[PDB]
Design a protein around this motif. Structure first.
Motif, PDB file in Angstrom:
ATOM      1  N   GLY A 237      -1.042 -11.912 -64.404  1.00  0.00           N
ATOM      2  CA  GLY A 237      -2.283 -11.322 -64.876  1.00  0.00           C
ATOM      3  C   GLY A 237      -3.128 -10.761 -63.750  1.00  0.00           C
ATOM      4  O   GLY A 237      -3.690  -9.668 -63.865  1.00  0.00           O
ATOM      5  N   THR A 238      -3.231 -11.497 -62.647  1.00  0.00           N
ATOM      6  CA  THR A 238      -3.975 -11.017 -61.493  1.00  0.00           C
ATOM      7  C   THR A 238      -3.185  -9.936 -60.763  1.00  0.00           C
ATOM      8  O   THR A 238      -1.952  -9.902 -60.798  1.00  0.00           O
ATOM      9  CB  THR A 238      -4.294 -12.169 -60.538  1.00  0.00           C
ATOM     10  N   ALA A 239      -3.913  -9.043 -60.101  1.00  0.00           N
ATOM     11  CA  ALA A 239      -3.306  -7.957 -59.347  1.00  0.00           C
ATOM     12  C   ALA A 239      -4.252  -7.571 -58.216  1.00  0.00           C
ATOM     13  O   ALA A 239      -5.226  -8.275 -57.930  1.00  0.00           O
ATOM     14  CB  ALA A 239      -2.983  -6.772 -60.264  1.00  0.00           C
ATOM     15  N   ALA A 240      -3.959  -6.446 -57.568  1.00  0.00           N
ATOM     16  CA  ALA A 240      -4.792  -5.943 -56.486  1.00  0.00           C
ATOM     17  C   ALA A 240      -4.726  -4.425 -56.481  1.00  0.00           C
ATOM     18  O   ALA A 240      -3.635  -3.849 -56.430  1.00  0.00           O
ATOM     19  CB  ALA A 240      -4.341  -6.505 -55.132  1.00  0.00           C
ATOM     20  N   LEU A 241      -5.892  -3.784 -56.535  1.00  0.00           N
ATOM     21  CA  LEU A 241      -6.000  -2.332 -56.543  1.00  0.00           C
ATOM     22  C   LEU A 241      -6.828  -1.890 -55.348  1.00  0.00           C
ATOM     23  O   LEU A 241      -7.800  -2.553 -54.977  1.00  0.00           O
ATOM     24  CB  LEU A 241      -6.637  -1.820 -57.843  1.00  0.00           C
ATOM     25  N   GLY A 242      -6.435  -0.789 -54.730  1.00  0.00           N
ATOM     26  CA  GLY A 242      -7.128  -0.336 -53.548  1.00  0.00           C
ATOM     27  C   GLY A 242      -6.966   1.139 -53.271  1.00  0.00           C
ATOM     28  O   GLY A 242      -6.547   1.916 -54.131  1.00  0.00           O
ATOM     29  N   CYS A 243      -7.313   1.517 -52.045  1.00  0.00           N
ATOM     30  CA  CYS A 243      -7.187   2.891 -51.585  1.00  0.00           C
ATOM     31  C   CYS A 243      -6.705   2.906 -50.141  1.00  0.00           C
ATOM     32  O   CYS A 243      -7.064   2.041 -49.332  1.00  0.00           O
ATOM     33  CB  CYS A 243      -8.518   3.645 -51.705  1.00  0.00           C
ATOM     34  N   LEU A 244      -5.912   3.926 -49.821  1.00  0.00           N
ATOM     35  CA  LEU A 244      -5.382   4.138 -48.483  1.00  0.00           C
ATOM     36  C   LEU A 244      -5.846   5.502 -47.998  1.00  0.00           C
ATOM     37  O   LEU A 244      -5.763   6.493 -48.737  1.00  0.00           O
ATOM     38  CB  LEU A 244      -3.847   4.048 -48.461  1.00  0.00           C
ATOM     39  N   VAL A 245      -6.341   5.538 -46.764  1.00  0.00           N
ATOM     40  CA  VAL A 245      -6.782   6.762 -46.124  1.00  0.00           C
ATOM     41  C   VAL A 245      -5.777   7.146 -45.043  1.00  0.00           C
ATOM     42  O   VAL A 245      -5.033   6.316 -44.513  1.00  0.00           O
ATOM     43  CB  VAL A 245      -8.203   6.621 -45.532  1.00  0.00           C
ATOM     44  N   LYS A 246      -5.757   8.435 -44.720  1.00  0.00           N
ATOM     45  CA  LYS A 246      -4.837   9.003 -43.747  1.00  0.00           C
ATOM     46  C   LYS A 246      -5.551  10.114 -42.987  1.00  0.00           C
ATOM     47  O   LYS A 246      -6.691  10.473 -43.306  1.00  0.00           O
ATOM     48  CB  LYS A 246      -3.567   9.528 -44.429  1.00  0.00           C
ATOM     49  N   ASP A 247      -4.862  10.632 -41.961  1.00  0.00           N
ATOM     50  CA  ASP A 247      -5.281  11.682 -41.025  1.00  0.00           C
ATOM     51  C   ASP A 247      -6.783  11.652 -40.763  1.00  0.00           C
ATOM     52  O   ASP A 247      -7.469  12.671 -40.896  1.00  0.00           O
ATOM     53  CB  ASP A 247      -4.817  13.103 -41.432  1.00  0.00           C
ATOM     54  N   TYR A 248      -7.302  10.483 -40.395  1.00  0.00           N
ATOM     55  CA  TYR A 248      -8.722  10.287 -40.121  1.00  0.00           C
ATOM     56  C   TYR A 248      -8.883   9.917 -38.648  1.00  0.00           C
ATOM     57  O   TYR A 248      -8.867   8.738 -38.286  1.00  0.00           O
ATOM     58  CB  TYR A 248      -9.299   9.221 -41.039  1.00  0.00           C
ATOM     59  N   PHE A 249      -9.033  10.931 -37.800  1.00  0.00           N
ATOM     60  CA  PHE A 249      -9.271  10.743 -36.372  1.00  0.00           C
ATOM     61  C   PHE A 249     -10.677  10.240 -36.040  1.00  0.00           C
ATOM     62  O   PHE A 249     -10.830   9.491 -35.067  1.00  0.00           O
ATOM     63  CB  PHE A 249      -9.004  12.044 -35.611  1.00  0.00           C
ATOM     64  N   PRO A 250     -11.744  10.637 -36.787  1.00  0.00           N
ATOM     65  CA  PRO A 250     -13.083  10.106 -36.484  1.00  0.00           C
ATOM     66  C   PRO A 250     -13.169   8.587 -36.429  1.00  0.00           C
ATOM     67  O   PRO A 250     -12.244   7.877 -36.835  1.00  0.00           O
ATOM     68  CB  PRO A 250     -13.938  10.664 -37.626  1.00  0.00           C
ATOM     69  N   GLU A 251     -14.305   8.089 -35.935  1.00  0.00           N
ATOM     70  CA  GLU A 251     -14.477   6.671 -35.664  1.00  0.00           C
ATOM     71  C   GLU A 251     -14.363   5.859 -36.954  1.00  0.00           C
ATOM     72  O   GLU A 251     -14.587   6.387 -38.044  1.00  0.00           O
ATOM     73  CB  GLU A 251     -15.834   6.432 -35.000  1.00  0.00           C
TER      74      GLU A 251
END
Ligand SMILES: *[C@@H]1O[C@H](CO)[C@@H](O)[C@H](O)[C@H]1NC(C)=O
Ligand SMILES: *[C@@H]1O[C@H](CO)[C@@H](O)[C@H](O)[C@H]1NC(C)=O
Ligand SMILES: *[C@@H]1O[C@H](CO)[C@@H](O)[C@H](O)[C@H]1NC(C)=O
Ligand SMILES: *[C@@H]1O[C@H](CO)[C@@H](O)[C@H](O)[C@H]1NC(C)=O
Lengths: 227, 211, 317, 211, 48
Positions: free
Chosen positions: A147-161
């Motif tokens: 029943g439990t899970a995990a949802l998220g987001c992944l970022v890419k090509d981010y050179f800034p700080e």
């Protein structure tokens, strides 16, 4: 109270020049020796440079020998650290530190620090500021466990700080996972923030994530689909 | 010149049990003018004891150490939830490698979840597969990939998150990046983690193409 | 300022400063725990605040511990014969405080040099700065370095990890001269009200003594501070505040003689104070040989029994 | 606070060849205040040399070692079949970890036997499987178990036996302890032993339920 | 202000330099005042 505020820093191309300032308030600047201490990202501390009550002598480290110059402008109450031909391995955060003194008949320093100001992060790389690429991370059927899970987001090509990210305008935490970003090839930082929320909750409430980009002011908000 | 060597490298105990740490100057004596600093990971280092004997004002009496000659030891009288930091010793010209004063807990079973690249990641030209270890203890692990049912390393990255205060457990993540052309040719991708506290290494396989 | 100065010059170029026209306070410097060595020759450290010096010299340099003992009169060593020689009759104090944390640096100090070779020994308070190549052998090099020809200067390389024997030490040499001149440097001793026509102790600008101070008819020129008699004794001084000349007269003194008939007749005695007026001593008769107390002066004349002097004799009736 | 490190950790010679033991004072120098001891694992240690130069009473003349500075070194002139013991150094505030002296021999192939739990063990509440290596040399081998054609670790207990004196060999067995609810699920239990002196690692399969 | 404790601790730590190691000192002071002697050497007496 006594505090040190560091000014300057940022991304500079390799071989460039930069100058860092250290303003001191709450005490007398004139009587104290000052030093600089580096802190590599996720590494130990290394001593950098040393300056007297007036700046007559310097104690430049072997790593920074001939490229770093420290100045102590006592009249306008500031410390300065200016460098040339800065190299890639010098990427770190700088700490402006003080040297304890007895202030008796003879000043007599003791080579131990008392207070540490907030550090200033410096970056050198051949890359340039780019907008991060954000994509959803929602487990579909036969991939979520229980029943439990995990949802998220992944970022890419981010050179800034390093970038900050939030979910539902920061209205819930549910055991947030910071997951500090990491460097890949071509000078890119990758961050993947996932919140452990059970999968049997989508449909009744909207699921959004905002990646607040402070350096380039690239505010991006996106939604997550259950696939 | 002088190099500071810290012993032990890492040290974990109960929240109440006290501990001791020792630094070693490589050679000679420096009039016992040694300093200890405790750095919380988020904040700047803070001085604890100076001249290797006398503790700075404002530091709790609990911190009290002494040493001489080659060796300088600091001993803590007791422990509370503030030791989640790195203790670096500092002589004239060098800092020690430091020691992470860890908090002890029972063995926790890791949980592994594998996330594939979505279509928008696929069209960009590269595919990244992520592995999420969760709520696992203690701090030692090894995660590998079985690409086309064959082990391969040297092309993936691993990141570990610092210990969380409320439950004293963490998460680890690992991203394997390949180009699209390489990602299409293989079929089976499997993820495994090795833990001394696990009866058997849990293996979770994956199938491409979704449904 | 000399003690607190950030940098100290090299030994072969030891820095000398002149101090005058001020009130010093050596109690702070002596009682301080900072200084490691404090040795005073020709004077004691506990009394430096009671004296007045015509001129003070302060010489500053940096040596190492093993040769700190070489800063002393009549010593033998590289500094004692080539860099900084003290006179045999030295009058002053030598103060050294460890300075590892001021001078010594990682990589060593290349700015601190000392002379290792010289044609001849040095004279007291003589500084040599020449960099001529020394001719060690019999071969004239004509200013060309090589074998048997070395650069006289040699580097120190103070490393903070070195042992205390080779560690930096800042040394200040306070040289005082106590001669006939109006002293300009004095200790922190508060002046008191001046009194005349009385036997008192006096400390005039460091000159101590005892006597009676009186108004003087002497006319000192406006450069002389104190005067002396034929026998070379200070008999006139100038007030350091009002510039008024005062004569100094030793307090009245003399011998005391007891004139008595034999105890075998009586126990009565008389006291003669030789060359002393008895209005100064605190029935009573005044003679030329002093004055006599306890004897009754009469009009009669008899053969001398006990000679008193100047035609005066005493006897028991 | 003093640490007294001994090198090498384990040194092996023929019963006649002599050797030396190099034990380094970690901090400063002892100034010759040192002692040596020899303890067979069956009884109490005995003193050998005191002050790091002189020898005690009753010791053989072969024991003669000298050392100064950090490097404190012990020499034995010639070897006899009594060296099977632990040599401990003696600084006044510490003790050495100990160095084992071994009688050398030709490499021997181990013999592996797997014993399943008996019927009495099959009703007690826990099953134990034992794997015994017999007549093996030298003292280095890896034992890995295969349950249901899958390796596992963190649940078996390994024990080593001291080398015999009649033939200079030892035996090593490991036992796996597990509840019955997990034993009946799997079918094949295999023991694999890896040795540098073996041409190929030795595997032995076992079928549950006997025959 | 400027009031500091009159005492200070040696802190004799066992592995110290020869200049810091603990040395036991006994000082014998002899009184040669005019009085009947009470302590003498092992010098044996002789017939008068
Ligand atoms: C101060 O010194 C001056 C001469 O410089 C003198 O005339 C004056 O009387 C002195 N005052 C006092 C209070 O001593
Ligand atoms: C003192 O008088 C006594 C009494 O007879 C006598 O014996 C003695 O000689 C006298 N001495 C002198 C010095 O006249
Ligand atoms: C003794 O003192 C008086 C009073 O001052 C003086 O007149 C007299 O001349 C003095 N006598 C001698 C002998 O000096
Ligand atoms: C001694 O004689 C003179 C005569 O000129 C007289 O004036 C004086 O009073 C006499 N002395 C005494 C003590 O009677």
């Amino acid at each position: 109270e006594v505090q040190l505020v560091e000014s300057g820093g940022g991304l500079v191309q390799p071989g460039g020049s930069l100058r860092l300032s250290c303003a001191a308030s709450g005490f007398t600047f004139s009587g104290y020796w000052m030093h600089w201490v580096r802190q590599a990202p996720g590494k130990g501390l290394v001593w950098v440079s040393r300056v007297n009550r007036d700046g007559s002598d310097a104690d430049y480290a072997d790593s920074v020998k001939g490229r770093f110059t420290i100045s102590k402008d006592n009249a306008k109450n500031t410390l300065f650290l200016q460098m040339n031909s800065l190299r890639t391995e010098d990427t770190a955060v700088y700490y402006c530190v003080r040297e304890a003194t007895t202030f008796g008949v003879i000043i007599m320093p003791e080579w131990y620090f008392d207070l540490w100001g907030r550090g200033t992060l410096v970056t050198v790389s051949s890359a340039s500021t780019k907008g991060p690429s954000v994509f959803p991370l929602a487990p579909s059927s036969k991939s979520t466990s229980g029943g439990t899970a995990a949802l998220g987001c992944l970022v890419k090509d981010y050179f800034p700080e390093p970038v900050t990210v939030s979910w539902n305008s920061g209205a819930l935490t549910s055991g947030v996972h910071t997951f500090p970003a990491v460097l890949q090839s071509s000078g890119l930082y990758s961050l993947s923030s996932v919140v452990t929320v059970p999968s049997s909750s989508l449909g009744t409430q909207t699921y959004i994530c905002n990646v607040n980009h402070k350096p380039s002011n690239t505010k991006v908000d996106k939604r997550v689909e259950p696939k | 010149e002088i190099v500071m060597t810290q012993s032990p490298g890492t040290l974990s105990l109960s929240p109440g049990e006290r501990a001791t740490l020792s630094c070693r100057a490589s050679q000679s004596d420096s009039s016992n003018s040694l300093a200890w600093y405790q750095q919380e990971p988020g904040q700047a280092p803070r001085l604890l004891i100076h001249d290797a004997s006398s503790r700075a004002t404002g530091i709790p009496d609990r911190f009290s150490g002494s040493g001489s000659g080659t060796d300088f030891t600091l001993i803590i009288s007791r422990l509370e939830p503030e030791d989640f930091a790195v203790y670096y010793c500092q002589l004239y010209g060098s800092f020690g490698q430091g020691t992470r004063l860890e908090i002890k807990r029972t063995v926790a079973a890791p949980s592994v979840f594998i996330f594939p690249p979505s279509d928008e990641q696929l069209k960009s030209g590269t595919a990244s597969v992520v592995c999420l270890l969760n709520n696992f203890y203690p701090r030692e692990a090894k995660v590998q990939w079985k690409v086309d049912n064959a082990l391969q390393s040297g092309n993936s990255q691993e990141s570990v998150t610092e210990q969380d205060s409320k439950d004293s457990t963490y998460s680890l993540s690992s991203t394997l990046t390949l180009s699209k052309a390489d990602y299409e040719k293989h079929k089976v991708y499997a993820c495994e983690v090795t833990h001394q506290g696990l009866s058997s290494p849990v293996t979770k396989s994956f199938n491409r193409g979704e449904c | 300022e000399v003690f607190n100065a950030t940098r100290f010059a090299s030994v072969y170029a030891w820095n000398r400063k002149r101090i005058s026209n001020c009130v010093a306070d050596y109690s702070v410097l002596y009682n301080s725990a900072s200084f490691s060595t404090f040795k005073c020759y020709g004077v004691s450290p506990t009394k430096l605040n009671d004296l007045c010096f015509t001129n003070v010299y302060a010489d500053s340099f940096v040596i190492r511990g093993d040769e700190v003992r070489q800063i002393a009169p009549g010593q033998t060593g590289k500094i004692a014969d080539y860099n900084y020689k003290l006179p045999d009759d030295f009058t002053g104090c030598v103060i050294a405080w460890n300075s590892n944390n001021l001078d010594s640096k990682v990589g060593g100090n290349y700015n601190y040099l000392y002379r290792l070779f010289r044609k001849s020994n040095l004279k007291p308070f003589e500084r040599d700065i020449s960099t001529e190549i020394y001719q060690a052998g019999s071969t004239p090099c004509n200013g060309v370095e090589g074998f048997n020809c070395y650069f006289p200067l040699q580097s120190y390389g103070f490393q903070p990890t070195n042992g205390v024997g080779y560690q930096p030490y800042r040394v200040v040499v306070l040289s005082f001269e106590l001669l006939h001149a109006p002293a300009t440097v004095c200790g922190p001793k508060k002046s008191t009200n001046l009194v005349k026509n009385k036997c008192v102790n006096f400390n005039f600008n460091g000159l101590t003594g005892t006597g009676v101070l009186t108004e003087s008819n002497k006319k000192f020129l406006p450069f002389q501070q104190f005067g002396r008699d034929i026998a070379d004794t200070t008999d006139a001084v100038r007030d350091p505040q009002t510039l008024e000349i005062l004569d100094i007269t030793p307090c009245s003194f003399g011998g005391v003689s007891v004139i008595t008939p034999g105890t075998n007749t009586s126990n009565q005695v008389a006291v003669l104070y030789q060359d002393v007026n008895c209005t100064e001593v605190p029935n009573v008769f005044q003679t030329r040989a002093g004055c006599l107390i306890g004897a009754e002066h009469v009009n009669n004349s008899y053969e001398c029994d006990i000679p008193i002097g100047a035609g005066i004799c005493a006897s028991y009736q």
